[PDB]
């Protein structure tokens, strides 16, 4: 029944935010990125392109509140797409794009790399939950919000992970980042050496197998210049270094 090697980007080649990769910046907002990228491309697969939006990180950064976690220190996937069917997100896209209601208000960083950007840094106050939209955006805040009919933890099974994104589309998950991930360019990850870093939450949007190794195709937050591209496969079917232990999704509601 399901493929052997699957990818949302060439399943939805009409739905362009599959294919991009963001940056949190200097902030620990990864539970938010998570949420936000899976539900841009849902949104679209749920009405076949005729609507792709960045739904705004910064929307639920700043508005979730004590619910999700503590903002820029940290949250829980789980709670952020249950606030998507709450409250509903506005649209927003990248820092100084002028894009959406509220596009990302934190600059872009260096994560583990060497670029022109300035180095990521621990600088991360939650900034402001300011209900209005950017000068000259059009539909008000009110009107800009897109919300979820539901939320829901996908069961800790590889099967039933692909069936999802399969028929539904992009996930979010979680898993624990090793110091040796920090170092990820190409291949199929597998934790070898280093101590543990934290939680760290991302959109997996299909599997393969890469020479006789099976995987998981996740996109990173740290912008498109770490790893392979943004992007970075991690082992699948072992539930290695938990990445199959905290799949959330959700379905959009129309317009
Ligand atoms: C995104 C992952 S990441 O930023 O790319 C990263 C990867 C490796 C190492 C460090 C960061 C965020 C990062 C949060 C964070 C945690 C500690 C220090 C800095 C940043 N990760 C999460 O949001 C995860 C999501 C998750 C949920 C469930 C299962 C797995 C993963 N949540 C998380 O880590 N939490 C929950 C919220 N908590 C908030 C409490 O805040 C703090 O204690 C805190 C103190 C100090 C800092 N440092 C700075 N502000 N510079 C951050 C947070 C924390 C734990």
């Given at each position: 029944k399901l493929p052997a090697s699957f990818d949302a980007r060439e399943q939805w080649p009409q739905c362009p935010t599959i294919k991009e990769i963001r940056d949190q910046g200097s902030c620990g907002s990864c539970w938010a990125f998570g949420a936000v990228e899976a539900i841009s491309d849902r949104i679209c697969i749920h009405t076949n392109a005729h609507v792709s939006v960045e739904v705004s990180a910064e929307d639920l950064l700043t508005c979730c509140g004590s619910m999700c976690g503590d903002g820029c220190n940290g949250g829980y996937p789980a709670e952020a797409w249950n606030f998507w069917t709450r409250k509903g997100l506005v649209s927003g896209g990248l820092?100084?794009?002028?894009?959406?209601?509220?596009?990302?208000?934190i600059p872009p960083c260096e994560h583990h790399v060497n670029g022109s950007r300035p180095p990521c840094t621990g600088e991360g106050d939650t900034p402001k939950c300011s209900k209005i939209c950017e000068?000259?955006?059009?539909?008000?805040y009110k009107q800009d919000k897109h919300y979820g009919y539901n939320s829901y933890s996908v069961s800790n099974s590889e099967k039933d992970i692909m069936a999802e994104i399969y028929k539904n589309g992009p996930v979010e998950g979680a898993f624990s980042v090793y110091?040796?991930?920090?170092?990820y360019k190409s291949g199929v990850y597998q934790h070898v050496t280093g101590e543990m870093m934290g939680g760290h939450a991302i959109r997996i949007l299909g599997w393969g197998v890469e020479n006789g190794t099976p995987y998981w195709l996740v996109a990173n937050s740290?912008?498109?210049?770490?790893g392979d591209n943004g992007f970075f496969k991690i082992l699948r079917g072992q539930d290695h270094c938990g990445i199959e232990s905290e799949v959330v999704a959700g379905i959009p509601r129309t317009d």
């Open positions: 820092y100084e794009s002028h894009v959406g209601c509220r596009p990302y208000s000068p000259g955006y059009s539909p008000t110091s040796d991930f920090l170092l740290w912008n498109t210049d770490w």
